[PDB]
Amino acid sequence: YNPEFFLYDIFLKFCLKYIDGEICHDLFLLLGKYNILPYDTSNDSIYACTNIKHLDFINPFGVAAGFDKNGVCIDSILKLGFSFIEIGTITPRGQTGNAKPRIFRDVESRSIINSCGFNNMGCDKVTENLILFRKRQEEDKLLSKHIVGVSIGKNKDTVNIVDDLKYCINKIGRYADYIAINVSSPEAGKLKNIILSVKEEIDNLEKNNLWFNTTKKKPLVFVKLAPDLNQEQKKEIADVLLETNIDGMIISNTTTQINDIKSFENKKGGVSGAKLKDISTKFICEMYNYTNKQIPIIASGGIFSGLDALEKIEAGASVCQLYSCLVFNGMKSAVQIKRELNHLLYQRGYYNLKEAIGRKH
Numbered sequence: 001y002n003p004e005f006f007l008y009d010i011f012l013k014f015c016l017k018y019i020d021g022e023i024c025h026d027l028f029l030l031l032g033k034y035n036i037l038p039y040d041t042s043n044d045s046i047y048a049c050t051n052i053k054h055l056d057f058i059n060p061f062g063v064a065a066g067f068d069k070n071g072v073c074i075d076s077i078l079k080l081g082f083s084f085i086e087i088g089t090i091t092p093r094g095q096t097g098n099a100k101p102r103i104f105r106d107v108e109s110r111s112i113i114n115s116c117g118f119n120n121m122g123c124d125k126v127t128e129n130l131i132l133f134r135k136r137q138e139e140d141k142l143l144s145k146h147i148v149g150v151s152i153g154k155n156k157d158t159v160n161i162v163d164d165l166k167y168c169i170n171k172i173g174r175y176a177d178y179i180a181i182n183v184s185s186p187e188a189g190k191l192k193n194i195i196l197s198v199k200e201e202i203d204n205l206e207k208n209n210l211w212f213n214t215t216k217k218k219p220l221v222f223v224k225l226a227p228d229l230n231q232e233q234k235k236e237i238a239d240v241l242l243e244t245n246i247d248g249m250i251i252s253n254t255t256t257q258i259n260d261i262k263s264f265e266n267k268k269g270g271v272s273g274a275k276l277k278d279i280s281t282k283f284i285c286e287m288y289n290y291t292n293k294q295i296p297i298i299a300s301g302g303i304f305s306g307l308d309a310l311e312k313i314e315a316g317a318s319v320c321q322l323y324s325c326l327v328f329n330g331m332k333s334a335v336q337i338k339r340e341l342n343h344l345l346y347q348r349g350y351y352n353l354k355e356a357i358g359r360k361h
């Protein structure tokens with residue numbers, strides 16, 4: 001409840017009526033590298049503690065993948081009140097991505113469509129940007145216990161999918177609290193291979209040497225699915241996940257099956273925000289049922305209010321990543337939504353958050 005937030009959250013709602021997305025985004029990215037973005041320091045409520053396997057998130061709210069792709073402000077994004085951030089996605093060979101502009105935001109429908117094309121400075125340049133932080137992380141107080149994952153994918157023209165990840169782990173795997181595979185860009189057996197492929201490198205890091213991360217342990221393997229699949233395709237996947245014994249999924253990414261949005265009729269790419277919430281709260285409640293409550297799930301897909309966030313948990317999401325929230329509601333988005341959830345896990349008579357995971361039977 002600062003003047004600082006509120007002041008920025010005028011500047012920004014201005015941006016969201018007059019400036020391009022990317023431009024606003026790349027501007028506000030810049031400040032936070034020069035550390036002029038307001039902090040959220042006030043201690044969280046332990047009752048909204050949460051974890052996946054052995055991965056402890058001081059609060060449930062992170063910044064989703066593709067927000068800080070190049071990991072250039074990790075600092076001042078986590079010091080807005082997010083437990084964790086997800087950086088990348090990052091390809092072994094860094095890309096300028098599709099031609100601009102490629103990020104378009106709806107202000108009424110609070111929705112975003114992008115054809116970015118995985119623009120990143122490349123696994124090499126990024127790893128160095130993360131390391132420089134893991135250093136900063138020991139010195140600075142306000143980054144103790146804050147989890148950084150890394151999203152990884154394949155180059156556009158890839159020699160082999162697996163070997164593009166393989167380079168990526170090898171480079172960065174030491175400094176991530178989790179690795180995020182994504183197969184969700186705008187069969188099951190080829191997936192199984194990848195997963196196994198990915199665990200193997202992470203199992204090779206441990207043998208050929210260490211963990212300069214926040215856990216100081218080997219990074220968990222999460223896959224980031226997309227909501228545009230059939231039951232058949234889905235259940236065929238779920239089995240792989242249990243077969244791969246996988247550390248967790250990140251339901252979901254950007255849908256492409258939304259054409260009710262006027263401003264976006266002339267655009268191509270995947271949509272994130274309000275119109276993708278519902279779709280993604282049903283995509284947790286299916287991939288929960290099939291894996292039979294055995295795989296931990298990180299929600300992403302139209303989370304804005306503490307209610308929006310609770311709907312994901314009670315579906316089965318042990319954690320919440322925000323992206324569109326920040327675009328629309330702003331820098332208070334952590335402080336506001338966190339306040340909102342505590343006042344809602346109460347209302348509902350949840351003793352703690354972890355009690356409320358998957359309480360849709």
Ligand SMILES: Cc1cc2nc3c(=O)[nH]c(=O)nc-3n(C[C@H](O)[C@H](O)[C@H](O)COP(=O)(O)O)c2cc1C
Pocket residue numbers: 064065066067069088089090103112113114116118151182224252253254271272273274276277300301302303321322323324325
């Ligand atoms: C402009 C833009 C870039 C994105 N880049 C990535 C990315 O590199 N890797 C990734 O895994 N997800 C990426 N996403 C997807 C988000 O991480 C998130 O899953 C999606 O936006 C849903 O969040 P929301 O509906 O809560 O905004 C991107 C989304 C947008 C709008």
Ligand SMILES: CCOC(=O)C1=C(Nc2ccc3ccccc3c2)OCC1=O
Pocket residue numbers: 012015016020021022023024025026028029032037077080103105326327328330331
């Ligand atoms: C590309 C995502 O959407 C934007 O461009 C956009 C945007 N994104 C960001 C990016 C980084 C941020 C860092 C800190 C606080 C808010 C932020 C908000 O804030 C206003 C706006 O228009």
Ligand SMILES: O=C(O)c1cc(=O)[nH]c(=O)[nH]1
Pocket residue numbers: 066089114115116117118119182184185186253254270271
């Ligand atoms: O960079 C992109 O095009 C991109 C990557 C991703 O994972 N999700 C998305 O919506 N866009």
